[PDB]
Design a protein around this ligand. Structure first.
Ligand SMILES: [Cu+2]
Ligand SMILES: [Cu+2]
Ligand SMILES: [O]
Ligand SMILES: [O]
Ligand SMILES: [W+6]
Length: 509
């Protein structure tokens, strides 16, 4: 067993040096280390809160919920910087853990950094991060039952940035370093690639709902595909990045960050994202997606039970300025963490049925055209342009019972690129429409994207796309090969793909 283990973050820490493409021009500090107060690290104890903290949609808060949240951020902003509870200290936590603050010295690897992103540590780390953040905010205003808002971008009216975050600096929830084009009641683009789409609001809303369905159902088919790939001590730069992390979560980061800043600060980069209050509220909904993913009660939607994940741990300051070590295993049950999320109390999530519409055969031509197979192709391949290839399937016309027991999964492995820049490419499968056919940004042929916030230690990544639905949706369940189109969107000039294949992945019970 070799679980990732944060060191004494007050003894072992160094300025952030990873994932920041323009350090010279950086708007925020790279000195992201937490203050040293001489505290001894204590083990986590489950909270004894009387009530469950009920996190609320940021666009539908009561006057008290908004005022308390505003009042708490104000108090946090007033704290001396060196206070571990301060506005700046809380932002630096993200920078320390995401941009090279710590090493794996406690595991016996002092020359390897810890990265909690692009791995199965993604969800539980941010869960713990927010747990303490919330409890700190509550303490500052003496509200024992204080709860964060969440950015419900899975709800149409929750998709624009809530107006509680807007205005000027007289509003504590305001951040000047945001994309000026995206703060004027504009609808978030959950599959943003750095350029505004020119599409009707109704269509952006519909595709956003399809993005949530894609991240949580179409591609989030099991723990590996949803949480991200296995990451243990000794592992130096990926593992595979999860569906939410490389999907809606990354899109929102780049959508909010100010593209006129050198690293698209604040939200556009891990090192600066925490200086925007909306960052935590975005991640509050990401945290909620883990809960929703379980609540779907679909096969494969189970929590990780690998000891190497369960026993991984981080260290945070709490509201008492004590150092607390927390483990992944202790954050899986929200009841025990004494918070949850106000839900709609309706039959269904608004995105629950946003599976792309079935492609009509009348809209398709016979074949995907003249295209070579993976075996006829020389890898690696460069994505300086669109790349198409036929991938051998492990089987054709699988039964519902077989599809119920294993996901057919497209693997794009050995994705090599400079990660000093934001990267995105899109993936389409069995695209073969007749000329003239109406298309949208969320057609059934669209498998999703690979999107990566900068995290240069070149870097090597892996993406996993679910095909059980898509092959049905494109009428290609009987075809021996599946035709894969990779479409570069940004940062792919130097990017290389080393392996492409399709596998049957048994659904874990
Ligand atoms: Cu994030
Ligand atoms: Cu993060
Ligand atoms: O993140
Ligand atoms: O993040
Ligand atoms: W319009």
């Amino acid at each position: 067993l070799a679980p990732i283990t944060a060191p004494d973050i007050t003894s072992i820490c160094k300025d952030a040096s990873s994932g920041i493409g323009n350090q010279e021009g950086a708007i925020r500090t790279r000195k992201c280390c937490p203050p040293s107060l001489g505290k001894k690290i204590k083990d986590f104890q489950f909270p004894n809160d009387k009530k469950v903290r009920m996190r609320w949609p940021a666009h539908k808060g009561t006057k008290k919920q908004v005022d308390d949240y505003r009042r708490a951020i104000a108090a946090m902003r007033a704290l001396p910087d060196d206070d571990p509870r301060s506005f700046v200290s809380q932002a630096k936590i993200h920078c320390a853990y995401c941009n090279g603050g710590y090493t794996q010295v406690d595991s016996g690897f002092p020359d390897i950094d810890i990265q909690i992103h692009n791995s199965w540590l993604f969800f539980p780390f941010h869960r713990w991060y927010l747990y303490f953040y919330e409890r700190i905010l509550g303490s500052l205003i003496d509200e024992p039952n204080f709860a964060l808002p969440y950015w419900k971008w899975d709800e149409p009216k929750g998709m624009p940035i809530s107006n509680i975050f807007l205005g000027d600096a007289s509003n504590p929830l305001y951040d000047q370093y945001r994309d000026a084009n995206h703060i004027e009641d504009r609808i978030v683009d959950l599959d943003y690639d750095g350029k505004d789409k020119d599409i009707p609001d109704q269509q952006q809303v519909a595709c956003n709902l399809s993005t949530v369905y894609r991240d949580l159902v179409r591609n989030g088919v099991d723990p590996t595909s949803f949480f991200g790939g296995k990451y243990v001590a000794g592992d130096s730069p990926d593992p595979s990045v999860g569906s939410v992390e490389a999907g809606s979560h990354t899109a929102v980061h780049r959508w909010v960050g100010d593209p006129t800043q050198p690293n698209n600060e604040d939200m556009g980069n891990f090192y600066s994202a925490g200086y925007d209050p909306v960052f935590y509220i975005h991640h509050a909904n990401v945290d909620r997606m883990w809960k929703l993913w379980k609540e779907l009660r679909l096969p494969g939607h189970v929590d990780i039970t690998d000891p190497d994940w369960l026993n991984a741990s981080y260290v945070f300051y709490d509201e008492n300025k004590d150092l607390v070590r927390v483990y992944n295993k202790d954050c899986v049950n929200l009841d025990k963490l004494k918070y949850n999320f106000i839900e709609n109390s309706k039959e269904v999530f608004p995105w629950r049925n946003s599976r792309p519409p079935q492609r009509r055969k009348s809209a398709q031509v016979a074949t995907t055209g003249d295209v070579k197979t993976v075996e006829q192709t020389k890898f690696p391949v460069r994505l300086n342009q669109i790349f198409k290839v036929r991938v051998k399937r492990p089987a054709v016309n699988r039964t519902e019972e077989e599809k119920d027991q294993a996901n057919e999964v497209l693997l794009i492995k050995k994705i090599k690129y400079d990660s000093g820049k934001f990267v995105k490419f899109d993936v389409f499968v069995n695209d073969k429409l007749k000329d003239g056919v109406f298309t949208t940004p969320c057609d059934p042929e669209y498998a999703g994207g690979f999107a990566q916030i900068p995290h240069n230690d070149v870097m090597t990544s892996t993406a996993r796309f679910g095909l059980n639905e898509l092959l049905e949706d494109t009428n290609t369940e009987g075809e021996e090969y599946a035709t894969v189109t990779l479409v570069p969107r940004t940062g792919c000039e130097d990017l290389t793909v080393g392996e492409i294949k399709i596998e049957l992945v048994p659904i874990p019970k």
